């Protein structure tokens, strides 16, 4: 009954659109919803030399890859969540539904 | 036998064990976050993986 949706995405606006649709999907069906908890975004970092050889001035590229995690708690029966979460997802976002 | 000598020297550790998953070469390996992918390959495929230059 306490069902915990984990929205993890690389993009923010796709993740904010999905978590906004899951608040509208929880408000229209009138089930009690703990708000989307913004988790601390993880910046995956790789700093390589630019040069494929060793013969320039030592320039470095610094590749970030931000991963944003939200999570939403619902007071909802199982099959109601199975219907909600299966509708209108966009491929940037990864959705993991925890039953209990 | 030859089968007792061909691959009998250990490949359990060191930069003679793991190799680039594209180049197949043994140098400048990005082992971080299980890329297992040499630094020139990563620099080619960064965009395709989701790595972006911002700051």
């Amino acid at each position: 009954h306490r069902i915990r949706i984990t929205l993890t995405s690389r993009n923010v606006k796709s993740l904010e659109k999905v978590c906004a649709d899951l608040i509208r999907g929880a408000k229209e069906k009138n089930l009690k919803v703990k708000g989307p908890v913004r988790m601390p975004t993880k910046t995956l970092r790789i700093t390589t030399r630019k040069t494929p050889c060793g013969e320039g001035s030592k320039t470095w590229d610094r590749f970030q890859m931000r991963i944003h995690k939200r999570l939403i708690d619902l007071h909802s029966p199982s099959e109601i969540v199975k219907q909600i979460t299966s509708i209108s997802i966009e491929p940037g976002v990864e959705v993991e539904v925890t039953i209990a | 036998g030859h089968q007792q000598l061909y691959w009998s020297h250990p490949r359990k550790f060191g930069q003679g064990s793991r190799s680039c998953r594209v180049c197949s070469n043994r140098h400048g390996l990005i082992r971080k976050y299980g890329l297992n992918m040499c630094r020139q390959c990563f620099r080619q495929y960064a965009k395709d993986i989701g790595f972006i230059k911002l700051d």
Binding site: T8, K42, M65, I67, E94 | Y45, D48, I49
Partner: peptide, 19 residues
């Protein structure tokens, strides 16, 4: 997944697949 890979590794593994 039964091995249960890290979320840092999962999104990088998703990229390597696409590459």
């Amino acid at each position: 997944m039964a091995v249960q890979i890290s979320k840092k590794r999962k999104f990088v593994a998703d990229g390597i697949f696409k590459a």
